[model samples]
Target chain A: GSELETAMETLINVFHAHSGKEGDKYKLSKKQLKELLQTELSGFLDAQKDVDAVDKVMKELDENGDGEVDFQEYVVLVAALTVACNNFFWENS
Target chain B: GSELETAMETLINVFHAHSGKEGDKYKLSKKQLKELLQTELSGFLDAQKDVDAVDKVMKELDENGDGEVDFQEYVVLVAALTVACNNFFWENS
Candidate 1:
């Protein structure tokens, strides 16, 4: 928690939604985000990429620097989330 | 805030414009379908997955049930959203 410094709340929420438990803990808390990226987002971003890149992504997405992605920004970010790995989102199933 | 609705409409705008929003709900509908595909899709369908399943995906992908995927559908269906994402479209496409 001490290392959380400047991590955004939504990133933690998104990561938790993707890989953390429900109700309890609820979100990644920055620390978990770093760990999960090292684990889940493996090919998406290299392990060597700055852990703070998440903050950079979130900040850039914030556009007006509002600390949150606008509706359009959020949609584009989510668009990136749809990774069709090994045929996940393919209609072929 | 009903964030989901707002969050989804962004892409809907793209889909809507790509297909011509004038009497073209196709784009709006297509984004929903695209989101559905990314979140709910599974794997490759064989050449003979039966018309029922194909018809369902085809309609989602095409919306108007038009035989061609055209620009609107193509925009929604492509964009490197996913790799193994269902690969089938009109056989000729």
Candidate 2:
């Protein structure tokens, strides 16, 4: 929860910097982000999630030879997740 | 996106009923889940996620040792997420 979170968050931050200069993303400080993640998860995503895993995953997913994933690529990310889950259930049960 | 939304929603409702009702294994609630989902995902989850896929993800997430996803287990839950994202990028890219 926490590891990939930081990596995801870093991406979000970059996204905000590029997209929302005056939005909450820009205004939120580091302290706020940490606390926000903890409370939001209400779980140990903070405790068990691995930063290295997140970093590695991020590097792998930023396809198109681009530095970052655009919104379109992001949708593909989610759709791909759903497809896998669908297959999992179909195969498992 | 919608499929996963409903699947996750169903899981959230289950969490709420279990947590609010009588039981030691009560997990998170629907309202809390929405809050958690909305805030944490603010532009996080992909927009094209399918419901069946979401159901699979939720099933994995709500792996109640007894009946529901305890907070601790949920943290470890993320272990699969980055990989899922990676696979998406790999196939789609």
Candidate 3:
């Protein structure tokens, strides 16, 4: 219930808010992941442009080769993107 | 600029807002990290309870063996915590 940008909690709730919309109420199907990316992470990826950003992410983030983007894989994606952006933010400041 | 779409941007800004208060301006000192944890993550940790949770985190998360917490190290921490909580969130649902 704490709202002080509970990053972990928010991230979890956010993921489920999207992941639960389709198949596998827990793991994010490719379609669900794509929608989550476009709706919640457009700043990180086009999600709709080029050869499909989710496809590329699926290839990279789907380390288990399960063809699905699970929570652990989702965390890796966020961590990697945030780390890169944090560097850019400080350098450009 | 895209609101919730800028999760990475928000995280970077949040980190600098705290880490810049004291030394390095890029890395978070123990004090700064503690403050960030207390204010932003009170729901995540007691921050004041125990013999200093930040010290424990610094020891475990400071993978580079540096006394300070860098962005990459910080990302690892967030990644681990978020992954753990996301799992719990689903199972509890």
Candidate 4:
């Protein structure tokens, strides 16, 4: 697979790796989200000084107010973060 | 960086690699989009039997009707494709 295809697969694999850890194997519970964020996105989490950053992120990602982040919702979070990263790179370069 | 972080970075890098090729430098012109699809996402483009797949994708992705796809708009396309891929994995697994 190309780098782009591999990257897309990684997103799916990473989400399921965390989402399957606890309740609702297809969605991310609050705890799973925290663990995923802390493990996979530690830099992003570290940049946030908010004590309740996970909860804030949960609220924002759970668009349907379902208290869980499904694949679609998770993708949205990644998409937003990627866009931010892209802007940072372009501005700095 | 973790797999997830690498994936996010790949998304940004892939976009800039192609988006920088033509007009605007930050946005994807139709020609650039076609080239990107043909190169990075050939599997996806091949799956679509429509001869005008790139045109259709361009129209859908150009949400602002600007005839060019910005980073945000490009991310939306990737996000949707990732979600679709995730669904395919889960259903087949």
Candidate 5:
């Protein structure tokens, strides 16, 4: 697999690793999302001083209003973050 | 870094790898995008029977009508593909 393909697989694997911990087995409950964020994106979470950061993220990503973040929703979050990171990289370089 | 973080980094790196190859180092010109798609996403392009698939993709991804794919626009393509891959994974499992 190309690097891009491996990266895409990592995205899928990371999502399932957390999402499969509890209910739904496919979608991320609030608890799972919080745990995933705290562990996988600690740097990002630490930068946000708000205690309700996870809640805010959940609200934003849960486009269907189901209180759960599905794979597509999760990808959207990753895509947005990647775009931000790209901008920061170019701006600083 | 976590697997998710690494994956995010890979997305940025892959875009820059190709985007830096031609005009507008920050964005992907048509030729650069075609090369990126062919090399990084060969499987995807192989699956598409249309010979003008790259042109179609360029048209779809160049959302600002700038005739080039910026990092954000490129991320959108990856996000959509990743979402499709995720759906395929669960559906087959």
Candidate 6:
């Protein structure tokens, strides 16, 4: 696979790795989401000042209202972040 | 950085690497998009046996109608692919 394919696969692998750390092996619970944001998205989530911030993220990510973040939801977050980063990359370049 | 962060960065890097091959270092020309699909998404684009397939993709990616694929458009494509992959992963698992 090329770098882009590998990168996409890596995200799948990363999501599974963290999702399996909790009850659901295929979804991320609130705690698992917090861990994911704190560990994998430390730089981006640094602005999460309080627990409510994490809760807010969780609320947004749980699109299906299942109280857990599935792979699609996670992908949405990644996509939004990537768009934001792309803007930042060109803003100063 | 975490695997997810690294994956996002790899995408950015990969885009620049391909986009830089021709005109517009920050946007992908039609040829560059075709090359990117053939190189990074061979499995997906292999179904594209005709030139119209490439044209269809270009038309879709050129959301702003500038005839070029920008970073945001590219990210949207990646996000859509990731969502499809996520569905595939769970459909069989």
For each candidate, the DockQ is 0.03, 0.03, 0.25, 0.52, 0.49, 0.40
Q: What lDDT is reached at residue A56 by model 5?
A: 49
Q: 3 or 5: which has the higher DockQ?
A: 5
TM-score of 3: 0.55
User: Which candidate number has the best TM-score?
Assistant: 4
Q: lDDT of all predictions, in order shown? A: 0.35, 0.38, 0.54, 0.59, 0.60, 0.60
For candidate 5, what is the DockQ?
0.49
lDDT of 1 by residue, A6-88 (tens): 11223333533643353233212333433443354444443223335345454643655324222223323433332212122
Clashing pairs in 6: none
In candidate 1, which residue ranges exceed 4 Å CA deviation?
A: A1-15, A23-93, B21-80, B83-93
Q: After superposition, how far is residue B5 of candidate 2 from its true place, in Å?
A: 32
Can you tell me which runs of candidate 2 are displaced by over 4 Å?
A1-4, A7-93, B1-31, B48-52, B59-69, B79-93
Q: Point out where model 6 deviates above 4 Å.
A: A21-35, A45-72, A82-93, B21-24, B29-35, B45-72, B82-93
Under CAPRI classification, how is model 1 graded?
A: incorrect
Q: What is the TM-score of chain A in candidate 5?
A: 0.60
Label model 6 with its docking quality class: acceptable
Worst 10 residues of 2 chain B by lDDT: B1-10
Per-residue CA lDDT of candidate 2, range B1-93, in tens?
222233333333433454556544345533344345444444345542445544554674376423444433333333233333433323545
Model 5 scores a TM of 0.64
Give native contacts recovered, as a fraction, per prediction. 0.00, 0.00, 0.20, 0.63, 0.61, 0.57
Ranking of models by TM-score: 4, 5, 6, 3, 2, 1
lDDT of 5 by residue, A1-93 (tens): 688877777777877775567567756775555466656776664444343534544566565534776665566566554443334543575
Q: Candidate 3 or 5, higher lDDT?
A: 5
- TM-score of every prediction relative to native: 0.23, 0.26, 0.55, 0.65, 0.64, 0.57
The TM-score measured for candidate 2 stands at 0.26
